[PDB]
Design an enzyme around this catalytic site. Structure first.
Site, PDB file in Angstrom:
ATOM      1  N   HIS A  46       5.151  -5.503  -1.042  1.00  0.00           N
ATOM      2  CA  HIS A  46       6.023  -6.151  -0.060  1.00  0.00           C
ATOM      3  C   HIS A  46       5.269  -6.815   1.084  1.00  0.00           C
ATOM      4  O   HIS A  46       5.813  -7.675   1.779  1.00  0.00           O
ATOM      5  CB  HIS A  46       7.125  -5.200   0.444  1.00  0.00           C
ATOM      6  CG  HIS A  46       6.747  -4.375   1.638  1.00  0.00           C
ATOM      7  ND1 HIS A  46       6.493  -3.023   1.556  1.00  0.00           N
ATOM      8  CD2 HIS A  46       6.644  -4.697   2.950  1.00  0.00           C
ATOM      9  CE1 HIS A  46       6.254  -2.547   2.764  1.00  0.00           C
ATOM     10  NE2 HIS A  46       6.341  -3.542   3.628  1.00  0.00           N
ATOM     11  N   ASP A  97       6.576  -0.673  -5.147  1.00  0.00           N
ATOM     12  CA  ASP A  97       5.875  -1.224  -3.993  1.00  0.00           C
ATOM     13  C   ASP A  97       4.418  -0.782  -3.989  1.00  0.00           C
ATOM     14  O   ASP A  97       4.020   0.128  -3.256  1.00  0.00           O
ATOM     15  CB  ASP A  97       6.571  -0.789  -2.706  1.00  0.00           C
ATOM     16  CG  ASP A  97       6.269  -1.702  -1.541  1.00  0.00           C
ATOM     17  OD1 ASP A  97       5.594  -2.733  -1.739  1.00  0.00           O
ATOM     18  OD2 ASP A  97       6.716  -1.383  -0.422  1.00  0.00           O
ATOM     19  N   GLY A 196       4.429  -2.089  10.488  1.00  0.00           N
ATOM     20  CA  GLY A 196       3.006  -2.362  10.650  1.00  0.00           C
ATOM     21  C   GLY A 196       2.132  -1.338   9.933  1.00  0.00           C
ATOM     22  O   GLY A 196       0.954  -1.585   9.678  1.00  0.00           O
ATOM     23  N   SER A 198       2.982  -0.120   6.917  1.00  0.00           N
ATOM     24  CA  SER A 198       3.141  -0.360   5.486  1.00  0.00           C
ATOM     25  C   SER A 198       1.832  -0.626   4.738  1.00  0.00           C
ATOM     26  O   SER A 198       0.934  -1.298   5.247  1.00  0.00           O
ATOM     27  CB  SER A 198       4.126  -1.507   5.260  1.00  0.00           C
ATOM     28  OG  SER A 198       5.436  -1.095   5.602  1.00  0.00           O
TER      29      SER A 198
END
Length: 247
Positions: A46, A97, A196, A198
């Site tokens: 993502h 993800d 932030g 991720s």
């Protein structure tokens, strides 16, 4: 990271800092990542799905600070950007993800291990820590939901793994969370990852050894009661990792 304590890149030697280049000369922070081998940086799809453009990315290893240099840091270009073909995003949940960034310096070298640059071990086939186990997360993400800027110094915190049964409860996430995902939060809801963070690592000590158990993926708000951070269950993607890292 909401709450937690400010740390250095010596305590988290496997953490990579991924930035994106812009038209003009402005470089902005994108997501975190982890060094799983000298020529590979794992991270989340993502983070790059909207700009699949490998030349636009810059990866830093051994970097403790957001917009400033660290002695011993190493800059890398992205030789290959591998996103999961089955990735999809629902109301809140992000599926599959996970992403892989083959790195190379301007000289064509990969990472060179040091006191500030080290790799993290991957888990074994379907071998995760018992629920209730304490794990750590690291990142340059928001310190507060109301912040619009990220902290200048790297942060870390400790959260506990939550079972699929608890995380699948109605007041939590219900059927949105799957078995390919891992919940994990503070029993007091005071600390958590945030925007932030991720792509960053969820590290758990598994039999004396630091293991990359999860990847920061999603969550409703930050440090909200009954809304745990959700992570990509790394042990469930080993075949995918092995197949894309060979040649």
């Amino acid at each position: 990271i909401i709450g937690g304590e400010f740390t250095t890149i010596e305590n988290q030697p496997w953490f990579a800092a991924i930035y994106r280049r812009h038209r003009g000369g402005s470089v902005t922070y994108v997501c975190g990542g982890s060094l799983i081998s000298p020529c590979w940086v794992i991270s989340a799809t993502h983070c790059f799905i909207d700009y699949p453009k490998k030349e636009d990315y810059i990866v830093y290893l051994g970097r403790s600070r957001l917009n400033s240099n660290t002695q011993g840091e190493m800059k890398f270009e992205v030789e290959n950007l591998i996103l999961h073909k089955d990735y999809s995003a629902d109301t809140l949940a992000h599926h599959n993800d996970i992403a892989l960034l083959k790195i190379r310096s301007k000289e064509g070298r990969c990472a060179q291990p040091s006191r500030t640059i080290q790799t993290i071990s991957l888990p074994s086939m379907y071998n995760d820590p018992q629920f209730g186990t304490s794990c750590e997360i690291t990142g340059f993400g928001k310190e507060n939901s109301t912040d619009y800027l990220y902290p200048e110094q790297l942060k870390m915190t400790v959260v506990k793994l939550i079972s699929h049964r608890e995380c699948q409860q109605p007041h939590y996430y219900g059927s949105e969370v799957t078995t390919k995902m891992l919940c994990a939060a503070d029993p007091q809801w005071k600390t958590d990852s945030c925007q932030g963070d991720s792509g960053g690592p969820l590290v758990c000590s598994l039999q004396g050894r630091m293991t990359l158990t999860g990847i920061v993926s999603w969550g409703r708000g930050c440090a909200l009661k009954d809304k745990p951070g959700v992570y990509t269950r790394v042990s469930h993607f080993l075949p995918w990792i092995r197949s894309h890292t060979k040649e």
